[PDB]
């Protein structure tokens, strides 16, 4: 259970990293 939750946390790091990238790309496209 602890080990699985640790992997959940680690994979969510990637989810947020990818989303940050998306936001940043849209900001430069719209000129923000």
């Amino acid at each position: 259970k602890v080990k699985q939750l640790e992997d959940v946390v680690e994979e969510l790091l990637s989810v947020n990293y990818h989303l940050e990238n998306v936001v940043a790309r849209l900001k430069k496209l719209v000129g923000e």
């Binding site: 946390v9 998306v22 936001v23 849209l26 900001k27 719209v30 923000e32």
Partner: protein, 31 residues
């Protein structure tokens, strides 16, 4: 203690995710 701490971490990351989802939604409409 560890499960509770990890659940808290999950919930903090989800909070950040929700905000980012909101931002993508706002930004893409402006395109």
């Amino acid at each position: 203690m560890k499960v509770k701490q990890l659940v808290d971490k999950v919930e903090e990351l989800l909070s950040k995710n929700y905000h980012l989802v909101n931002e993508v939604a706002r930004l893409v409409k402006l395109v």
